[PDB]
Design a protein around this ligand. Structure first.
Ligand SMILES: Nc1ncnc2c1ncn2[C@@H]1O[C@H](COP(=O)(O)OP(=O)(O)CP(=O)(O)O)[C@@H](O)[C@H]1O
Ligand SMILES: [Ca+2]
Ligand SMILES: [Ca+2]
Ligand SMILES: [Mg+2]
Length: 1011
């Protein structure tokens, strides 16, 4: 069966031997499972290891160090080419820092993919089928669907396999198949066969494809292909590498990356220029071209040192960390920019039903009319026990057990709930619980019919399975459903045209209507009291609405629904059911029967989440299509409003919002916190009004009425137990429906930006000190304190792992107390620019002072004066200004080792400053980031290694230091902490919990270094 769209519905069902009513057997499914297998696609390997490494070396900042490593190679291969001892050490230390950052980036990217893939199996994909075990619809796993079984699918569902449409229950069926054919509109389907055997998928009507969603309607069909035999499975090879747009923060770092490479080039050009007079010095052999090449290597080695080469890698691991940290909290992050954009979210619009509430509805009370005075009416208000979907409960009239058969209004109320219902109740023998098949509002009515049991049937000898739809089957055996005017959110109602099967009374067909109590009652002209009908007046209209308003605004905050019937409807011939606007024209002159109120408890984590968002400057707005009285009462429960807060201008309806010119409509959208009774058209309109104020909007939803708003918001967050239409229009999915994961995603997105600013602060405060070290030496006339191979050792030790370990920084202590960040402001602030220069100027002066100390004040070194150190090039044995000074000590490796050791040490102490922007080290000790402690101990281990290992001091032109000289290195390196603790102190006090184990740990160190 490969061309099913060209065959009649009877011909396809005959091919499988299946009936559309009873379904498929279980001896047939066992045979079909062996010949066809499970309905699932093989797992894709994704980005391979080699491809994942190539993406690390595609940024400009990494391509400079690649070219500089090539320059250092071709410049060291022409002099002493056949060598490996000291010639090719400069290109080697340039490549080690590149492969170190490439390993961390690939390993962290591989971790985020593994956590995401392990989250796809959180809850298995399910599918509704008809099988001969039960006479009702049952949920099974989508992988256990075999070709040939009857599958039922409704609005919002995801088509589990290729389905030949057998019967459409509603007036029309729309399917969103942009995933397969690429058309951005819902396609209308039918049940008639198409003649063309080679029709394209756009022309393949009467066929629903796996992976696509049902946009509107309800239908059933027979599966014709599963697994790799579906249209979306046969094209899984046509999966080209999509152009993933850069994160809006990555665009800020790319502009900053090219702006920094332009200023670094001007700095390296200046280094080669300010040293013109040193080209023909005797150190280089008196040759100009020999000295010009030497200072070209200092400029190249300074470019590698000054350029942040781990910046494209650290943004990779941070975004990869945010994805893995969210997948551990059961949150599927589809779009990479989504977790970073949530850190700047200012408004969180949220669906109420199914999103802020558990969606575990249960009809707990109802009422019918007892007797009509003529101006007022007495109501027979009942109550029902039970909070789950199990059909075990008791109906009480006045807290006394009552039987529903003696009330003819209850018999009629149960009939409307049974027939005007596109849902059912399923038993789960694996879990031992009754679960819903369809919407929660309708299954609550399906379970209510079982508890009422208006037609007293023997319900004791039936199993758990046959008790889910026992009382409903009795009602549906009495009335024959003709067609369904499906639920449309413009009228907020739904009717069903039923005909009584009994020909004895010869009753004409009726229309059983259920919907929102506000609109349905307005279309009601009569009221059903007991078994007789009496015309409705405006006095009894107030009594019915007042009870419903008490239910919604009460303590239980009930979700109400009115039930009505139409005694004399038009025939099917006169009704024009093609369009949907005529449906409200047939739901007129109704007879009000009763109203039901079902409880929908909010989720436990919602109340604490709204409190954390308000503290973080975020605003939570409830966009619901439910009643205003129910919405405001839920908002007072979850914390959006106070239990006595006035909401005269913070809660609006769809009608009240439209009856407002754009003047007041604007100033009401940023001040409101609850929108009730809004269509899917309004929800996206609310979201675009909030984006008009330059606000990052995050919409959270579960149903098809939220997909237009989920597409317009910057971030769309879908619930895991929601419809597949909402989960398709969303960037993040809460697999466990935990609303507290949203605020964790905001804290994580703010952490990605914080780790970025600390990385920038560390590689600019430090690398400026390496640039100042070279220019300060030149302006003072001192001997050069660093050679190219040592400028490349500082880059490896300081710009390597101690810089990437900043992406593992812990969140700040005030991370979620600051207002949301505006993504339009510049990356680096003007105050941060001062903090970079203030630290760098000390790092540079400390490195020059370390070399100047040995030449002037050290005991082992000469006691050379400041004049002789500044004019060291003019020293000969005939100069009376240089007496006793052996002027071969100006090339000694001691001052170059003091400067190399101070540069490395002062940058490790500057990394300890880069754990937070303003929190001191006594408040956030360095062991809160253990990846940084290990990176510093490794960098200091490698520094001590080249100082004392057999051949290495010769390769780097350094000499081993003693304990007295190492105490001097620490004397100058430690004040870089005190300088940044001071700059952090000013930012806290004048611009914007001391750990005693840390204070007591550093005091034996601080007193030792300074005596
Ligand atoms: N199957 C159904 N049949 C008839 N009326 C329904 C219905 N489902 C919901 N309604 C009613 O239509 C009204 C508005 O439609 P809507 O689809 O927006 O409700 P909803 O359950 O989605 C609230 P939310 O938007 O917060 O999820 C609801 O208040 C409800 O009373
Ligand atoms: Ca560097
Ligand atoms: Ca550095
Ligand atoms: Mg909802």
């Amino acid at each position: 069966m490969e061309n099913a769209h060209t065959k009649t519905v009877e011909e396809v069902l005959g091919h499988f031997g299946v009936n559309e009513s009873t379904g498929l057997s279980l001896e047939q499914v066992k045979k079909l499972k062996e010949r066809w297998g499970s309905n699932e696609l093989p797992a894709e390997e994704g980005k391979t290891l080699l491809e994942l490494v190539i993406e690390q070396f595609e940024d400009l900042l990494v391509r400079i160090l690649l070219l500089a490593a090539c320059i250092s190679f071709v410049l060291a291969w022409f002099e002493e080419g056949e060598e490996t001892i000291t010639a090719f050490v400069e290109p080697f230390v340039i490549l080690l820092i590149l492969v170190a950052n490439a390993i961390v980036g690939v390993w962290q990217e591989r971790n985020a993919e593994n956590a995401i893939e392990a989250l796809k199996e959180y809850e298995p994909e399910m599918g509704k089928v008809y099988r001969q075990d039960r006479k009702s619809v049952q949920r099974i796993k989508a992988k256990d669907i075999v070709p040939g079984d009857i599958v039922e699918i409704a609005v919002g569902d995801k088509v589990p396999a290729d389905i030949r449409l057998t019967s459409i229950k509603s007036t029309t069926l729309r399917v969103d198949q942009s995933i397969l054919t690429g058309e951005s509109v819902s396609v209308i389907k039918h049940t008639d066969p198409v003649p063309d055997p080679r029709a394209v998928n756009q022309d393949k009507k009467n066929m629903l494809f796996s992976g696509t969603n049902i946009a509107a309607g309800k239908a059933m069909g027979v599966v014709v292909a599963t697994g790799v035999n579906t249209e979306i499975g046969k094209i899984r090879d046509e999966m080209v590498a999509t152009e993933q747009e850069r994160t809006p923060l990555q665009q800020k770092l790319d502009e900053f990356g090219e702006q920094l490479s332009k200023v670094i080039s001007l700095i390296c050009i200046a280094v080669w220029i300010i040293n013109i007079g040193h080209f023909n010095d005797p150190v280089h052999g008196g040759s100009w071209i020999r000295g010009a090449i030497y200072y070209f290597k200092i400029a190249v080695a300074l470019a590698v040192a000054a350029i942040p080469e781990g910046l494209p890698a650290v943004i990779t691991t941070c975004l990869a960390l945010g994805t893995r940290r969210m997948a551990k909290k059961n949150a599927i992050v589809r779009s990479l920019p989504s977790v970073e954009t949530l850190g700047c979210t200012s408004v969180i619009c949220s669906d109420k039903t199914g999103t802020l509430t558990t969606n575990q509805m249960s009809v707990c009370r109802m009422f019918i009319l007892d007797r009509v005075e003529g101006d007022t009416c007495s109501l027979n208000e009942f109550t029902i026990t039970g909070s789950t979907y199990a059909p075990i409960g008791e109906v009480h009239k006045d807290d006394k057990p009552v039987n529903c058969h003696q009330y003819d209004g209850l018999v009629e109320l149960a009939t409307i709930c049974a027939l005007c219902n596109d849902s059912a109740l399923d038993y789960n023998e694996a879990k031992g619980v009754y679960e819903k098949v369809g919407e929660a509002t309708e299954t609550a009515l399906t379970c209510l019919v079982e508890k009422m049991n208006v037609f007293d049937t023997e319900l004791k000898g039936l199993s758990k399975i046959e008790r889910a739809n026992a009382c409903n089957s009795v009602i549906k055996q009495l009335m024959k459903k003709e067609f369904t005017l499906e639920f449309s959110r413009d009228r907020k109602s739904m009717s069903v045209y039923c005909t009584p099967n009994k020909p004895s009374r010869t009753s004409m067909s009726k229309m059983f209507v259920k919907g929102a109590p506000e609109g349905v009652i307005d279309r009601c002209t009569h009221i059903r009291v007991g078994s007789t009908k009496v015309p409705m007046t405006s006095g009894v209209k107030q009594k019915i609405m007042s009870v419903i308003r008490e239910w919604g605004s009460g303590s239980d905050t009930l979700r109400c629904l009115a039930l009505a019937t139409h005694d004399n409807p038009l025939r099917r011939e006169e009704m024009h059911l093609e369009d949907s606007a005529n449906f409200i024209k047939y739901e007129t002159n109704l007879t009000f029967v009763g109203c039901v109120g079902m409880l929908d408890p909010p989720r436990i984590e919602v109340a604490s989440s709204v409190k954390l968002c308000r503290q973080a400057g975020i605003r939570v707005i409830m966009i619901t299509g439910d009643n205003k009285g129910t919405a405001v009462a839920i908002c007072r429960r979850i914390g959006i409003f106070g239990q006595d807060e006035d909401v005269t201008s913070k809660a609006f309806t769809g009608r009240e919002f439209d009856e407002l010119n754009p003047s007041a409509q604007r100033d009401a959208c940023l001040n409101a916190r609850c929108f009730a009774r809004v269509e899917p058209s309004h929800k996206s309109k609310i979201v675009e009004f909030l984006q008009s104020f330059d606000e990052i909007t995050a919409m959270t939803g579960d149903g098809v009425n939220d997909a237009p708003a989920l597409k317009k918001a910057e971030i769309g967050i879908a619930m895991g137990s929601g419809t597949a239409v909402a989960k398709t229009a969303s960037e993040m999915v809460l697999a466990d429906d935990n609303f507290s994961t949203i605020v964790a995603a905001v804290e994580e997105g703010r952490a990605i930006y914080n780790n970025m600013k600390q990385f920038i602060r560390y590689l600019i405060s430090s690398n400026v000190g390496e640039v100042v070290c070279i220019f300060l030496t030149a302006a003072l006339g001192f001997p050069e304190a660093l050679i190219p191979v040592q400028l490349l050792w500082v880059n490896l030790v300081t710009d390597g792992l101690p810089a990437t370990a900043l992406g593992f920084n812990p969140p700040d202590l005030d991370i979620m107390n600051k207002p949301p960040r505006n993504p339009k402001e510049p990356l680096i602030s003007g105050w941060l620019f001062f903090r970079y220069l203030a630290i760098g100027c000390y790092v540079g002066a400390a490195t020059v002072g370390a070399a100047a100390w040995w030449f002037i004040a050290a005991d082992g070194g000469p006691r050379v004066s400041f004049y002789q150190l500044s004019h060291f090039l003019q020293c000969k044995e005939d100069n009376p200004d240089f007496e006793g000074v052996d002027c071969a000590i100006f090339e000694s490796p001691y001052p170059m080792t003091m400067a190399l050791s101070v540069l490395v040490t002062i940058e490790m102490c500057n990394a300890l400053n880069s754990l937070s922007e303003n929190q001191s080290l006594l408040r956030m000790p360095p062991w809160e980031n253990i990846w940084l402690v290990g990176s510093i101990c490794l960098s200091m281990s490698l520094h001590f290694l080249i100082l004392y290992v057999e051949p290495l001091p010769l390769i780097f032109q350094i000499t081993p230091l003693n304990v007295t000289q190492w105490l001097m290195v620490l004397k100058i390196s430690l004040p870089v902490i005190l300088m940044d603790e001071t700059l952090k102190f000013v930012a806290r006090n004048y611009l914007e919990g001391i750990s005693w184990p840390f204070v007591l740990l550093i005091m034996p160190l601080v007193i030792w270094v300074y005596s």
